[PDB]
Scaffold this active site. Structure first.
Site, short mmCIF file in Angstrom:
data_model
loop_
_atom_site.label_atom_id
_atom_site.label_comp_id
_atom_site.label_asym_id
_atom_site.label_seq_id
_atom_site.Cartn_x
_atom_site.Cartn_y
_atom_site.Cartn_z
N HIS A 108 0.80 -1.22 0.00
CA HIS A 108 0.00 0.00 0.00
C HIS A 108 0.83 1.27 0.00
CE1 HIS A 108 0.31 -0.27 4.55
NE2 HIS A 108 0.37 1.05 4.42
N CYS B 195 4.55 1.22 9.27
CA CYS B 195 4.34 0.09 8.37
C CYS B 195 5.66 -0.29 7.72
CB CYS B 195 3.28 0.43 7.33
SG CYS B 195 1.68 0.27 8.00
N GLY C 56 3.41 5.81 10.36
CA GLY C 56 4.75 5.68 9.82
C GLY C 56 5.45 4.36 10.09
C1 LIG Z 1 1.22 2.02 8.08
O1 LIG Z 1 2.26 2.77 8.64
C2 LIG Z 1 -0.02 2.13 9.08
C3 LIG Z 1 0.28 1.69 10.58
C4 LIG Z 1 -0.88 2.03 11.51
C5 LIG Z 1 -1.15 3.55 11.73
C6 LIG Z 1 -1.73 3.63 13.18
N1 LIG Z 1 -1.15 2.43 13.84
C7 LIG Z 1 -0.69 1.54 12.97
O2 LIG Z 1 -0.16 0.44 13.22
N2 LIG Z 1 -1.08 1.35 8.57
C8 LIG Z 1 -2.20 1.89 8.09
O3 LIG Z 1 -2.30 3.12 8.10
C9 LIG Z 1 -3.39 1.01 7.53
C10 LIG Z 1 -3.41 1.15 6.01
C11 LIG Z 1 -4.25 0.16 5.23
C12 LIG Z 1 -3.97 0.25 3.78
C13 LIG Z 1 -4.03 -1.26 5.63
N3 LIG Z 1 -4.69 1.37 8.16
C14 LIG Z 1 -4.81 1.35 9.57
O4 LIG Z 1 -4.03 0.70 10.26
O5 LIG Z 1 -5.72 2.08 10.26
C15 LIG Z 1 -7.06 2.05 9.94
C16 LIG Z 1 -7.93 1.15 10.83
C17 LIG Z 1 -8.62 1.87 12.06
C18 LIG Z 1 -9.58 0.94 12.85
C19 LIG Z 1 -10.52 0.08 11.89
F1 LIG Z 1 -11.22 -0.86 12.56
F2 LIG Z 1 -11.49 0.87 11.35
C20 LIG Z 1 -9.74 -0.58 10.74
C21 LIG Z 1 -9.02 0.46 9.96
#
Ligand SMILES: *[C@H](O)[C@H](C[C@@H]1CCNC1=O)NC(=O)[C@H](CC(C)C)NC(=O)OCC1CCC(F)(F)CC1
Ligand SMILES: *[C@H](O)[C@H](C[C@@H]1CCNC1=O)NC(=O)[C@H](CC(C)C)NC(=O)OCC1CCC(F)(F)CC1
Lengths: 300, 299
Positions: free
Chosen positions: B41, B144, B142
């Site tokens: 992503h 990921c 940040g």
């Molecule tokens: C990448 O750096 C990031 C890591 C997370 C940000 C906050 N804590 C983390 O570990 N990952 C993401 O931003 C993903 C991106 C997608 C393309 C997989 N999204 C995410 O982790 O947050 C959205 C969640 C929030 C709670 C929910 F139940 F709605 C599921 C989506």
């Protein structure tokens, strides 16, 4: 909601590259190789014979540079000196991977990372809090002496601990790099009594702020205890003196809850939560610093 | 107690961490030999993040679409997609690549995580892959592309690459075969997370740790067999117990049989009734048999 508050260590690569094995006669243990210096605990000079009351001044004078070999995992020892409970050896090659560093003496309630080593080989890392009785928990087996503890600021390593001892209750202590033993313990194989532990007030406060930040503020009330009144209360109730910091102030700004309100909360919670939880605990927690909470919960 | 959350030394893995940039997005990558792995992503614009077409994004990319930076910069000469990961090829082989494998771990297994931001290692901690295929730990925006790993011998096993945070604040990620643990999806949408369970084999390890420390008030002669305990586990939120050589060694050293501790678990699950075990009033399931062997015995 899982908090996000975890026991987190600094990456150890910079320190791993400084770990060596120091041998003197029959004993071996770990040392820290920085530039042309190798640091290690002086009881590497003691033979198993005399460990209950070694004469360290005598042992040192009995030594030559050839008494010591440092193995990396080709270092001729060209100098030896004693500094408190540590040896300060000098070798003829500078460590090419020496990081930028300083030395510090940590104070109770501060956390640091420990890289546990055996025979010069790093095997594990974990984080400890210097307790108010100047012991640490951690995991240290035979052969672990000379393992080091440190913090990081920038890519600068602050070296603060070199492992020496297990205490009677299973906790541990070691030296600062000025040679002094945390807690005034002797580096002799003699039964020694550690003092009673206390709750680290400022860490407990940081943890309640972590709680508030996570949406658990049931324990907050308008009631306030002053720092001074608290600190007098604390003498009689197994708490350390509270000392404010910029780090704690930033949590109070972020939450809008004043330090004094949490000091009052602590006086109430100290008798039990009365059925409630905080961050999945029924007891106050004091192994998270205000820095931990800023860093881990707000990315500051 | 002597039993603490202990991570593998992270130097071998720090040397492999890089930053990967694609348009707006930036995250961490893992640089092994001539390959850089990262979450796919990194290709998604913030806008399209709730349902991306990863297949279409990848075809629109060229090799110049990915920038890779060490903390040098590394020229991308190939790009491919493997499940939820990108496999970039770069023209420089990582001169500090450790011996490694890619093995997917199973619930109850513990591994070390090196949390990174913009390619810079900033912390390390240890997690347990829970039976619902989530981990806890600490991951901010940040993070990921941060990686989880164990080390057996000289060989690093890479087993996790960080992808996302679930609604309850737990986390999940990919194995390096490109599959997502728990078949979560790498889309920013609320997802159904299965119910957690106690990791039975880790609870046994912790009880052996208690025994090894002189705390055995909970051991009785009574036993419950493995098959009987596993039928019970189904109804009481425990995983199936499967023994290992590592558990067998704890049994040998203490003289206490696995089956005595499985009985003990069935009784301790209803409450310790005012006692503690290793400072705890609840069952602990975040320490493995391997942990106990190493931290209390040196194996
Ligand atoms: C990448 O750096 C990031 C890591 C997370 C940000 C906050 N804590 C983390 O570990 N990952 C993401 O931003 C993903 C991106 C997608 C393309 C997989 N999204 C995410 O982790 O947050 C959205 C969640 C929030 C709670 C929910 F139940 F709605 C599921 C989506
Ligand atoms: C050096 O590797 C070793 C590390 C300890 C072995 C087990 N856990 C450890 O941290 N250090 C020692 O063995 C010291 C050596 C002396 C010269 C200081 N001695 C020691 O750790 O054990 C003796 C204790 C017994 C308990 C006590 F509280 F009474 C104080 C002395």
């Amino acid at each position: 909601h899982h908090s996000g508050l975890v026991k987190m260590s600094h990456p150890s690569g910079d320190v791993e590259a400084c770990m060596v094995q120091v041998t003197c006669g029959s004993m071996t243990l770990n040392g820290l190789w920085l530039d042309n210096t190798v640091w290690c605990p002086r009881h590497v000079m003691c033979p198993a014979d005399q460990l209950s009351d070694p004469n360290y001044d005598a042992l040192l004078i009995s030594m030559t540079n050839h008494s010591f070999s440092v193995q990396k995992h080709n270092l001729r020892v060209v100098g030896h000196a004693m500094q408190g409970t540590l040896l300060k050896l000098t070798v003829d090659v500078a460590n090419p991977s020496t990081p930028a560093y300083t030395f510090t003496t940590v104070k109770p309630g501060a956390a640091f990372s420990v890289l546990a080593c055996y025979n010069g080989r790093p095997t594990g890392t974990f984080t400890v809090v210097m307790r108010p009785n100047y012991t640490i928990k951690g995991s240290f087996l035979c052969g672990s002496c000379g393992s080091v503890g440190y913090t990081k600021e920038g890519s600068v390593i602050n070296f603060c601990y070199m492992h020496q001892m297990e205490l009677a209750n299973g906790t541990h202590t070691g030296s600062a790099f000025d040679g002094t033993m945390y807690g005034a313990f002797m580096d002799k194989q003699v039964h020694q009594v550690q003092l009673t532990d206390k709750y680290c007030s400022v860490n407990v406060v940081a943890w309640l702020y972590a709680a508030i930040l996570n949406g658990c503020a049931w324990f907050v009330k308008p009631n306030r205890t002053s720092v001074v009144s608290f600190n007098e209360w604390a003498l009689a109730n197994q708490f350390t003196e509270f000392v404010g910091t910029q780090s704690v102030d930033m949590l109070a700004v972020k939450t809008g809850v004043a330090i004094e309100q949490l000091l009052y909360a602590i006086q109430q919670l100290y008798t039990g939560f009365q059925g409630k939880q905080i961050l999945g605990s029924t007891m106050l927690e004091d192994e998270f610093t205000p820095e931990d909470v800023n860093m881990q919960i707000m990315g500051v």
